[PDB]
Ligand binder design. Structure first.
Ligand SMILES: *[C@@H]1O[C@H](CO)[C@@H](O[C@@H]2O[C@H](CO)[C@@H](O[C@@H]3O[C@H](CO[C@H]4O[C@H](CO)[C@@H](O)[C@H](O)[C@@H]4O)[C@@H](O)[C@H](O[C@H]4O[C@H](CO)[C@@H](O)[C@H](O)[C@@H]4O[C@H]4O[C@H](CO)[C@@H](O)[C@H](O)[C@@H]4O)[C@@H]3O)[C@H](O)[C@H]2NC(C)=O)[C@H](O)[C@H]1NC(C)=O
Ligand SMILES: *[C@@H]1O[C@H](CO)[C@@H](O[C@@H]2O[C@H](CO)[C@@H](O[C@@H]3O[C@H](CO[C@H]4O[C@H](CO)[C@@H](O)[C@H](O)[C@@H]4O)[C@@H](O)[C@H](O[C@H]4O[C@H](CO)[C@@H](O)[C@H](O)[C@@H]4O)[C@@H]3O)[C@H](O)[C@H]2NC(C)=O)[C@H](O)[C@H]1NC(C)=O
Ligand SMILES: *[C@@H]1O[C@H](CO)[C@@H](O[C@@H]2O[C@H](CO)[C@@H](O[C@@H]3O[C@H](CO)[C@@H](O)[C@H](O[C@H]4O[C@H](CO)[C@@H](O)[C@H](O)[C@@H]4O)[C@@H]3O)[C@H](O)[C@H]2NC(C)=O)[C@H](O)[C@H]1NC(C)=O
Ligand SMILES: *[C@@H]1O[C@H](CO)[C@@H](O[C@@H]2O[C@H](CO)[C@@H](O[C@@H]3O[C@H](CO)[C@@H](O)[C@H](O[C@H]4O[C@H](CO)[C@@H](O)[C@H](O)[C@@H]4O)[C@@H]3O)[C@H](O)[C@H]2NC(C)=O)[C@H](O)[C@H]1NC(C)=O
Ligand SMILES: *[C@@H]1O[C@H](CO)[C@@H](O[C@@H]2O[C@H](CO)[C@@H](O[C@@H]3O[C@H](CO)[C@@H](O)[C@H](O)[C@@H]3O)[C@H](O)[C@H]2NC(C)=O)[C@H](O)[C@H]1NC(C)=O
Ligand SMILES: *[C@@H]1O[C@H](CO)[C@@H](O[C@@H]2O[C@H](CO)[C@@H](O[C@@H]3O[C@H](CO)[C@@H](O)[C@H](O)[C@@H]3O)[C@H](O)[C@H]2NC(C)=O)[C@H](O)[C@H]1NC(C)=O
Ligand SMILES: *[C@@H]1O[C@H](CO)[C@@H](O[C@@H]2O[C@H](CO)[C@@H](O[C@@H]3O[C@H](CO)[C@@H](O)[C@H](O)[C@@H]3O)[C@H](O)[C@H]2NC(C)=O)[C@H](O)[C@H]1NC(C)=O
Ligand SMILES: *[C@@H]1O[C@H](CO)[C@@H](O[C@@H]2O[C@H](CO)[C@@H](O[C@@H]3O[C@H](CO)[C@@H](O)[C@H](O)[C@@H]3O)[C@H](O)[C@H]2NC(C)=O)[C@H](O)[C@H]1NC(C)=O
Ligand SMILES: *[C@@H]1O[C@H](CO)[C@@H](O[C@@H]2O[C@H](CO)[C@@H](O[C@@H]3O[C@H](CO)[C@@H](O)[C@H](O)[C@@H]3O)[C@H](O)[C@H]2NC(C)=O)[C@H](O)[C@H]1NC(C)=O
Ligand SMILES: *[C@@H]1O[C@H](CO)[C@@H](O[C@@H]2O[C@H](CO)[C@@H](O)[C@H](O)[C@H]2NC(C)=O)[C@H](O)[C@H]1NC(C)=O
Ligand SMILES: *[C@@H]1O[C@H](CO)[C@@H](O[C@@H]2O[C@H](CO)[C@@H](O)[C@H](O)[C@H]2NC(C)=O)[C@H](O)[C@H]1NC(C)=O
Ligand SMILES: *[C@@H]1O[C@H](CO)[C@@H](O[C@@H]2O[C@H](CO)[C@@H](O)[C@H](O)[C@H]2NC(C)=O)[C@H](O)[C@H]1NC(C)=O
Ligand SMILES: *[C@@H]1O[C@H](CO)[C@@H](O[C@@H]2O[C@H](CO)[C@@H](O)[C@H](O)[C@H]2NC(C)=O)[C@H](O)[C@H]1NC(C)=O
Ligand SMILES: *[C@@H]1O[C@H](CO)[C@@H](O[C@@H]2O[C@H](CO)[C@@H](O)[C@H](O)[C@H]2NC(C)=O)[C@H](O)[C@H]1NC(C)=O
Ligand SMILES: *[C@@H]1O[C@H](CO)[C@@H](O)[C@H](O)[C@H]1NC(C)=O
Ligand SMILES: *[C@@H]1O[C@H](CO)[C@@H](O)[C@H](O)[C@H]1NC(C)=O
Ligand SMILES: *[C@@H]1O[C@H](CO)[C@@H](O)[C@H](O)[C@H]1NC(C)=O
Ligand SMILES: *[C@@H]1O[C@H](CO)[C@@H](O)[C@H](O)[C@H]1NC(C)=O
Ligand SMILES: *[C@@H]1O[C@H](CO)[C@@H](O)[C@H](O)[C@H]1NC(C)=O
Lengths: 48, 453, 126, 128, 127, 52
């Protein structure tokens, strides 16, 4: 989304998380800095 | 002619001060019964024949509203509850989706909408297996998830994780005495008609306060002390509507509260060594829990309170209303704890009477609850386990808590609504005659003696 | 008479029962009750130790009634002995002389130190 | 040199010559858990015991003195035992066993004697 | 007037005139770190103060800033004359010099006080 | 696991050692320990030879 360092510094991320009830997971999303996420596999789609 | 300074150690002088006090309970409370929140052998035994020394020709200024030893008592009670609930089972697994339906017994076919039969999946001892368990929940402790009315959740699941009160531990209030350390003293105002503030002509001193039962209740002070001469109305500032009025009755009004249903308990293993005690079916015919108050006695008491109120409010019409039925259940109903179960009784029939200047028993319908968020703190909830068999208590109404409504444009009439927050008022009604002073034994005064060279 | 029994009594009557106050000055489980008991006991010990230290610094150590060599300034209170001693109480005197307590304490410390130096020198001469 | 409690079984006369070691030994980091709290509680209790004994000695006028002679007459009701035998034949334990009944009354009597002595001394100084 | 420890650099005799300030300064919350910290610091200060007071009481100097004793000075401990001791050095230097024999002098003071005590006891018993 | 319907087991910290090392129990100030040196003492009753 940058106009065009600070372009690649951030990543969209969608994941599942527990709700207030520990039997239902809700699909949420957030913005994470690339310094806080490490790729899982080599395909560049799943992070942690 | 020529005087010299003289130092006296042990001078009977004092000064106002704030300190920390320790607890002392009766020796009978140490007979086994380690299952106790308040005095589980953590209080020193009470001193037999407590020594009260009457101080003569002394006048001291008291203030029940700016008094210490009430905030400290509240903090001590909160810490005691937290400590006693530390080893108890945390109901974290219980925050799960419940499939609730209105349970239909034989008597239901014949207040059965007050409970629902909720079945939910509970994790067994093995983390990879679940068991479809069932329980009975009061409708006050569950809220719907959707608008379809099939799936519910515990009311606390958006706030915190409730802690099942340990079934062995007994939170029955017992008399607690507050004692100062060495170098401090308690001044007791023996003036019988003392209104809670101002100078006190008759003052004495003690080391420990009288037995104060830490009973938590709303709209009605239970199992408290009583005035000696007349009903005493106490307020920090009567003309201020935001200050609750504490009424002290010299005659106790007996109230008998019962839960006549025969409930059954069941155990649900929610983890390794963790059991959650739930509600099974109800045995026999169902009858709503209620409290009984003698009509004549309560009418006389309310008439006396009205007389005192019109004395303090000369040119106005004093009328008693009931608290609005839209707020929290803790403040709109007379809530208390009877025999381990929490009651919430509707006192609309008590303060329904109006007075003009010119064998029957009142029955108050009550509702039981299991998930209790006391201290008005969001995030501190517990689950009171069900108790098998009927439950009966016989408390003494020794005081009321009123609140004058805001002065409207239509003046010449004042409405008093029972209730008022700040649960510290329950303790304040008992610690009105006590204050804490620090002894300053070192004194210097001139005398005709000079130390030898 | 009990503890603080002479609170409303005059000076002469109250001074006859300083002992009960002095003895009650030091009268006498993880959780909250035990911790509070320990904290209060420490604080009471501290108060007792400060009082004892002051009495020792003034040369009145181990004494309930101690005459000192500090002259009584008339500016502190011009009232003669008999009126204050058979008319007033200890609370009233404390509130009157509350302004000048620090000065009298400092004077007592200096007087005791000077007496100590003088006694040491007198013994040294012998 | 005799050690701490060395003269426990000795007679009163011989034991009274070794009070310094006992007097010295009467007042000879920690985690936030139960253990450190308990240990520092024992420290506080020892301090209270020392201060209580010191306060009693001061109230009797014998502050700072291991052996102090007082003005309280000894009632024959408490004991009628002769002196050379009580000081050369009895240990401290046996004596304490006999006088365990009357210790408290003697404590009050010592205190009242000291307070009266103080009052009379103040009066005598005021006379001058 | 001189502040706390203000006579540290002064000579012995000059520093002996400011004992009251040091003696007074010797005894000048919840389960958080600072409540507990204040708690053990206060307990330790009380312990040290009581230890020093016990030593003074055992030497018979209880309640006294300056206390003459009956123990004779030994030239082995130090052979300097009084005038240079009290007009040349400071308390720090003297303490450094005497630290070898401090325990011996303490023991001698205790024994001397006890000896004087039993002397006075038997003397009063004679009357 | 045998414990899973009873309580949650806690792994012993691998770096933490717990071999029994000698420990002495000491009384605080104002208290003393009496050690019975009677070599034939059966653990109860009077003891002739005592030490502190
Ligand atoms: C204002 O003040 C009043 C007066 O004090 C007070 O009412 C009292 O409430 C307490 C608490 O509920 C009552 O004590 C309980 O009473 C019953 C019956 O026992 C009474 O009667 C028998 C026969 O004479 C006496 O032997 C006995 O002493 C009592 O007088 C019982 O339910 C209670 O015992 C159980 O609960 C105790 C908890 O404190 C346990 O310690 C005890 O072991 C018992 O529990 C065990 O048995 C249960 C039954 O099987 C079982 O479910 C448990 O798991 C466990 O195994 C207890 O004695 C007291 O009698 C009331 N007094 C009066 C005069 O009515 C009000 O409550 C108070 N008001 C407020 C608002 O606080
Ligand atoms: C948050 O949580 C949700 C809910 O669990 C997850 O959503 C699931 O994601 C998985 C993985 O993407 C989905 O599975 C996929 O579904 C699609 C449909 O497959 C179905 O139908 C075929 C038959 O046509 C079946 O074979 C299959 O089992 C399913 O029933 C397809 O995209 C995928 O199947 C295809 O690909 C795989 C390999 O790629 C092959 O094995 C299959 O045969 C087939 O070719 C796959 O099955 C699943 O449907 C989602 N659930 C729901 C309810 O939508 C989110 O992924 C999770 N995480 C995030 C970040 O949101
Ligand atoms: C609240 O609802 C729950 C369910 O959400 C309910 O618990 C259920 O009780 C029944 C009856 O005890 C259980 O039935 C079991 O399973 C089968 C059903 O056929 C049978 O093996 C057994 O039933 C016996 O009793 C029946 C009469 O009801 C006979 O017809 C039959 O032959 C058997 O003798 C066995 O009990 C069912 O599994 C539970 N469900 C759960 C999830 O535990 C509970 O009773 C309701 N409570 C109230 C107060 O209404
Ligand atoms: C304690 O108990 C009392 C009763 O003893 C209880 O007050 C009752 O509240 C209920 C509702 O909870 C009232 O019943 C109805 O409530 C709603 C209010 O919106 C309406 O359906 C009705 O009000 C109509 O009343 C008139 C009908 O003739 C109409 O003219 C008018 O326009 C309204 O539409 C009806 O009131 C019930 O009446 C009261 N009862 C009394 C005696 O006030 C109270 O809530 C309980 N307290 C607690 C804390 O639970
Ligand atoms: C000022 O307050 C004091 C303290 O409360 C009052 O003293 C109390 O007086 C009552 C009434 O006499 C005493 O109760 C009675 O005492 C005796 C036995 O002691 C006996 O007559 C009765 O059985 C009853 O118990 C009470 O003991 C006493 N309290 C104390 C601590 O002495 C005093 O009366 C008050 N004075 C005024 C003028 O109000
Ligand atoms: C309890 O009784 C005390 C007296 O024992 C009451 O205190 C009195 O309060 C009134 C007001 O309610 C004071 O009057 C006002 O005082 C000041 C100074 O004059 C001023 O604001 C007004 O002009 C007015 O006069 C009165 O002085 C005060 N008395 C004393 C002795 O302090 C107290 O209000 C009573 N409380 C209740 C709840 O009844
Ligand atoms: C007890 O509560 C009453 C009611 O709140 C207090 O009276 C109120 O006092 C405030 C000031 O504290 C008044 O506000 C001031 O009033 C006048 C103009 O009316 C003026 O001085 C200022 O501009 C300011 O607005 C307020 O009007 C007054 N209200 C009433 C109804 O009298 C009273 O002070 C409280 N008493 C005590 C002892 O705290
Ligand atoms: C609710 O209030 C009633 C009425 O005030 C209380 O009953 C009273 O309780 C007292 C304290 O136990 C009784 O005094 C004692 O009674 C007997 C001799 O009768 C004896 O133990 C003592 O010498 C002392 O006098 C008093 O008699 C009793 N009054 C009546 C009319 O029964 C009751 O305790 C309060 N609490 C409840 C019911 O939980
Ligand atoms: C009563 O008990 C005491 C204390 O246990 C006994 O004294 C002990 O006696 C033994 C045997 O003589 C001593 O062991 C010896 O000590 C020295 C070296 O320390 C040396 O002679 C030998 O190598 C041997 O180890 C032991 O130290 C001693 N303990 C003390 C504290 O003095 C005493 O013998 C017992 N009395 C009777 C009658 O049984
Ligand atoms: C208790 O205190 C009240 C309140 O101060 C005293 O009531 C006073 O009584 C005198 C004598 O009748 C009156 O002059 C005062 O005006 C009253 N004060 C008030 C505020 O009304 C009462 O006398 C005291 N009672 C005792 C027994 O000490
Ligand atoms: C409640 O008690 C009041 C008085 O406390 C009773 O009302 C009074 O009754 C007497 C006796 O007939 C009359 O002299 C008064 O004028 C009455 N006062 C009022 C305001 O009516 C009353 O009857 C009792 N019962 C109820 C239900 O109010
Ligand atoms: C620090 O040392 C200086 C220098 O010795 C001290 O000043 C001396 O004070 C003495 C005592 O009054 C006088 O006799 C000397 O004449 C002074 N010397 C000088 C050079 O002024 C000073 O007092 C010392 N300060 C402290 C705090 O000990
Ligand atoms: C002064 O101190 C010296 C050194 O400690 C003492 O000399 C000791 O005397 C004893 C008794 O005769 C001998 O057993 C030691 O061997 C000596 N020590 C040394 C190091 O030689 C001396 O007695 C002390 N003098 C006084 C008067 O106390
Ligand atoms: C240790 O204590 C035991 C038990 O009291 C002593 O045994 C006694 O020995 C005497 C002498 O032989 C017998 O007369 C007693 O009957 C024994 N007592 C018992 C209870 O059996 C033993 O002597 C003591 N040991 C020492 C070394 O004193
Ligand atoms: C209980 O079930 C019976 C039989 O289906 C039904 O007739 C009755 O209305 C039900 N009672 C309720 C729901 O209260
Ligand atoms: C409740 O029912 C049980 C049987 O389920 C019976 O044994 C018990 O006596 C009943 N309790 C009461 C108080 O009636
Ligand atoms: C109180 O005053 C009266 C009247 O002067 C007096 O008789 C009495 O002794 C006094 N009481 C005390 C304790 O001082
Ligand atoms: C009394 O106090 C005044 C004021 O501080 C002071 O100036 C004066 O020297 C003092 N007089 C005596 C005799 O102590
Ligand atoms: C123990 O008693 C014996 C025998 O009477 C005696 O000789 C000895 O001195 C005593 N020991 C002590 C330390 O008093």
């Amino acid at each position: 989304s940058s106009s065009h360092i600070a372009m690649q510094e951030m990543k969209n991320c969608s994941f599942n998380m527990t709700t207030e009830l520990r039997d239902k997971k809700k699909k949420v999303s957030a913005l994470f800095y690339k310094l806080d996420i490490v790729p899982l596999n080599k395909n560049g789609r799943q992070y942690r | 002619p020529n005087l010299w300074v003289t130092v006296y150690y042990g001078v009977p002088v004092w000064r106002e001060a704030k300190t920390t006090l320790f607890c002392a309970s009766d020796a009978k409370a140490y007979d086994r019964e380690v299952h106790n929140v308040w005095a589980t052998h953590a209080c020193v035994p009470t001193d037999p024949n407590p020594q009260e020394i009457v101080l003569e020709n002394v006048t001291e200024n008291f203030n029940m509203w700016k008094n210490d030893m009430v905030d400290q008592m509240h903090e001590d009670i909160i810490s005691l509850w937290d400590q006693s609930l530390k080893p108890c089972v945390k109901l974290t697994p219980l925050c799960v989706t419940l499939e609730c339906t209105a349970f239909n017994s034989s008597s239901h076919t014949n207040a059965m909408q007050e409970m629902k039969n909720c079945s939910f999946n509970m994790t067994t001892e093995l983390r990879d297996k679940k068991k479809k368990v069932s329980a009975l929940f009061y409708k006050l402790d569950i809220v719907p998830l959707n608008k379809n009315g099939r799936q519910y959740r515990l009311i606390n699941c958006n706030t915190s994780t409730c802690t099942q009160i340990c079934p062995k531990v007994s939170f029955d209030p017992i008399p607690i005495h507050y004692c100062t350390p060495a170098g401090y003293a308690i001044l007791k105002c023996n003036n019988k008609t003392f209104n809670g503030t101002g100078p006190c002509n008759n003052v004495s001193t003690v080391q420990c306060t009288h037995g104060i039962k830490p009973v938590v209740s709303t709209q009605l002070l239970l199992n408290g002390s009583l005035a000696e001469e007349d009903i005493i109305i106490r307020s920090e500032n009567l003309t201020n509507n935001a200050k609750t009025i504490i009424v002290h009755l010299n005659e106790s009004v007996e109230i008998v509260c019962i839960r006549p249903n025969n409930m059954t308990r069941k155990s649900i293993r929610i983890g390794p060594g963790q059991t959650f005690y739930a509600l099974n079916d109800i045995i026999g015919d169902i009858r709503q829990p209620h409290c009984n108050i003698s009509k004549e006695k309560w009418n006389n008491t309310l008439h006396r309170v009205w007389k005192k109120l019109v004395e303090h409010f000369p040119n106005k019409t004093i009328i008693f209303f009931d608290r609005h039925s839209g707020g929290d259940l803790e403040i709109t109903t007379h809530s208390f704890n009877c025999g381990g179960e929490f009651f919430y009784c509707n006192t609309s029939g008590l303060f329904n009477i109006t007075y003009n200047s010119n064998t029957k028993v009142i029955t108050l319908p009550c509702r039981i609850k299991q998930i209790i968020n006391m201290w008005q703190e969001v995030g501190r909830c517990m689950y009171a386990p069900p108790i098998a068999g009927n439950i009966t208590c016989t408390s003494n109404i020794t005081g009321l808590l009123l609140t004058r409504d805001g002065g409207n444009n239509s003046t010449e009439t004042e409405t008093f609504r029972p209730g008022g927050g700040d649960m510290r008022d329950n303790w304040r009604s008992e610690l009105y005659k006590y204050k804490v002073v620090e002894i300053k034994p070192l004194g210097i005064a001139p005398t005709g003696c000079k130390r030898r060279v | 008479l009990g503890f603080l029994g002479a609170a409303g009594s005059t000076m002469g009557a109250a001074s006859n029962t300083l002992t009960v106050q002095a003895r009650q000055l030091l009268s006498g489980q993880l959780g909250v009750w035990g911790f509070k008991q320990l904290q209060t006991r420490v604080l009471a010990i501290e108060r007792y130790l400060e009082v004892q230290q002051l009495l020792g610094l003034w040369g009145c150590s181990g004494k309930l009634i101690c005459c000192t060599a500090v002259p009584w300034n008339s500016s502190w209170s011009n009232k003669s002995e008999t009126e204050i001693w058979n008319n007033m109480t200890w609370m009233q005197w404390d509130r009157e002389i509350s302004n000048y307590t620090n000065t009298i304490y400092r004077l007592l410390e200096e007087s005791q130190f000077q007496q100590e130096i003088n006694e040491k020198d007198l013994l040294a001469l012998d």
